[PDB]
Scaffold this motif. Structure first.
Motif, short mmCIF file in Angstrom:
data_model
loop_
_atom_site.label_atom_id
_atom_site.label_comp_id
_atom_site.label_asym_id
_atom_site.label_seq_id
_atom_site.Cartn_x
_atom_site.Cartn_y
_atom_site.Cartn_z
N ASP A 44 53.49 34.15 46.90
CA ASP A 44 53.60 33.53 48.16
C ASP A 44 55.06 33.55 48.67
OD1 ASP A 44 55.17 31.09 47.79
OD2 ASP A 44 53.88 30.00 49.12
N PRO A 45 55.31 33.16 49.94
CA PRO A 45 56.69 33.11 50.50
C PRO A 45 57.55 32.01 49.80
CG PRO A 45 55.00 33.03 52.27
CD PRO A 45 54.30 32.74 50.95
N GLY A 46 57.64 32.10 48.46
CA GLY A 46 58.42 31.14 47.67
C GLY A 46 59.13 31.90 46.60
N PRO A 47 58.42 32.28 45.56
CA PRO A 47 58.99 33.08 44.53
C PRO A 47 59.51 34.36 45.13
CG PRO A 47 56.57 32.84 44.15
CD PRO A 47 57.00 31.94 45.31
N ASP A 90 54.68 46.93 37.90
CA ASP A 90 55.81 47.48 38.48
C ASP A 90 55.49 48.81 39.20
OD1 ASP A 90 57.58 45.49 37.90
OD2 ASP A 90 59.01 46.80 36.96
N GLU A 91 54.18 49.17 39.38
CA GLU A 91 53.90 50.41 39.96
C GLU A 91 52.49 50.67 39.99
OE1 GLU A 91 54.54 53.23 36.55
OE2 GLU A 91 55.60 51.51 35.80
N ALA A 92 51.63 50.12 40.86
CA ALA A 92 50.22 50.59 40.79
C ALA A 92 49.69 50.87 42.27
CB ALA A 92 49.47 49.55 40.27
N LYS A 93 50.65 50.93 43.32
CA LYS A 93 50.24 50.89 44.63
C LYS A 93 49.45 51.99 45.03
CE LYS A 93 54.79 50.68 46.05
NZ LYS A 93 55.70 50.73 44.87
N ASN A 94 50.11 53.15 44.78
CA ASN A 94 49.62 54.40 45.29
C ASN A 94 48.21 54.51 45.11
OD1 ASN A 94 50.72 57.68 46.03
ND2 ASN A 94 51.84 55.91 46.72
N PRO A 95 47.57 55.27 45.95
CA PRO A 95 46.16 55.43 45.92
C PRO A 95 45.66 56.46 44.98
CG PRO A 95 47.14 55.80 48.11
CD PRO A 95 48.11 56.08 47.04
N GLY A 96 46.49 57.12 44.15
CA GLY A 96 45.96 58.14 43.27
C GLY A 96 47.12 58.61 42.34
N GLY A 97 47.77 57.62 41.64
CA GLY A 97 48.90 57.95 40.75
C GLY A 97 49.36 56.74 39.87
N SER A 102 46.90 49.23 45.06
CA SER A 102 47.09 49.48 46.44
C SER A 102 46.58 48.39 47.29
CB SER A 102 46.38 50.83 46.90
OG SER A 102 45.09 50.53 47.42
N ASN A 103 45.47 47.78 46.86
CA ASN A 103 44.78 46.76 47.69
C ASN A 103 44.91 45.46 47.20
OD1 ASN A 103 42.72 49.42 47.60
ND2 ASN A 103 43.38 48.74 49.59
N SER A 104 44.83 45.33 45.91
CA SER A 104 44.99 43.98 45.26
C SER A 104 44.43 43.88 43.72
CB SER A 104 44.30 42.92 46.14
OG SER A 104 43.84 41.83 45.36
N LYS A 105 44.54 44.97 42.87
CA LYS A 105 43.84 44.93 41.52
C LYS A 105 44.49 45.53 40.42
CE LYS A 105 42.00 49.69 42.11
NZ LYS A 105 40.95 50.61 41.57
N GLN A 106 45.62 45.54 40.46
CA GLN A 106 46.42 46.24 39.45
C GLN A 106 47.81 46.40 39.97
OE1 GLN A 106 47.35 47.32 36.97
NE2 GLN A 106 46.20 48.66 35.68
N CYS A 107 48.39 45.40 40.51
CA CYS A 107 49.88 45.56 41.01
C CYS A 107 50.69 44.72 40.12
CB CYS A 107 49.92 45.18 42.52
SG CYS A 107 48.88 46.33 43.70
N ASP A 108 51.88 44.01 40.55
CA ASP A 108 52.70 43.24 39.41
C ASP A 108 52.58 41.74 39.42
OD1 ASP A 108 55.32 42.10 38.85
OD2 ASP A 108 55.50 43.68 37.58
N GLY A 109 53.50 41.05 40.00
CA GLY A 109 53.44 39.56 39.96
C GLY A 109 54.06 38.84 41.14
N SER A 161 50.56 44.42 50.28
CA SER A 161 50.75 44.61 51.64
C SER A 161 50.50 43.41 52.30
CB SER A 161 50.02 45.84 52.17
OG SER A 161 48.96 45.45 53.03
N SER A 162 49.88 42.54 51.54
CA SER A 162 49.69 41.13 51.92
C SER A 162 48.55 40.33 51.20
CB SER A 162 49.61 40.98 53.34
OG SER A 162 48.99 39.75 53.70
N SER A 163 47.88 40.87 50.09
CA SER A 163 46.84 40.06 49.43
C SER A 163 47.28 39.63 48.05
CB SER A 163 45.46 40.79 49.41
OG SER A 163 44.68 40.33 50.51
N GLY A 164 48.52 40.00 47.61
CA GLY A 164 49.01 39.52 46.32
C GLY A 164 48.94 40.49 45.31
#
Length: 94
Positions: free
Chosen positions: A46-49, A57-64, A69-76, A81-84
Motif C-alpha cells: 500500500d502507499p505506506g511501505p 524481484d522479477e515476475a512481471k513479464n508476461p513470458g519470462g 504481471s497481474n498479481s500472482k507471483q511478484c515480490d512484496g 501495476s496496481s493490485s499488489g
C-alpha cells in the motif's frame, strides 16, 4: 500473512509461486480464520511501505520472469501495476 515482509516465499510452483498458499494464500500480514494468518491482507503494498516489504524481484513479464504481471507471483512492496504484485519497488520491513 505476517507483515510487510512476510514474504510468503512465494516460490515453489508455475501457477503461481508455491502457489500463494497460506494466509489467504499469501504472506505478508494476513490473519487466519483463527487470525492466525489465512484471512485479512498481505501487506497491501500500500502507499505506506513501498519497499519495506518484499518477496520476489522479477515476475512481471508476461513470458519470462517468474511470471505474474497481474498479481500472482511478484515480490512484496509492489503493485502489479496496481493490485499488489508488479510495478512498485520491493524493500521488506525487518
Amino acid at each position: 500473512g505476517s507483515g510487510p515482509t512476510y514474504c510468503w516465499n512465494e516460490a515453489n510452483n508455475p501457477g503461481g509461486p508455491n502457489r500463494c498458499s497460506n494466509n489467504k494464500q499469501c504472506d505478508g500480514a494476513r490473519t487466519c480464520s483463527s487470525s492466525g494468518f489465512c484471512q485479512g491482507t498481505s501487506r497491501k503494498p500500500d502507499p505506506g511501505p513501498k519497499g519495506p516489504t518484499y518477496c520476489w524481484d522479477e515476475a512481471k513479464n508476461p513470458g519470462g520472469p517468474n511470471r505474474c504481471s497481474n498479481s500472482k507471483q511478484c515480490d512484496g512492496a509492489r503493485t502489479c501495476s496496481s493490485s499488489g504484485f508488479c510495478q512498485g519497488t520491493a524493500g521488506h520491513a525487518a
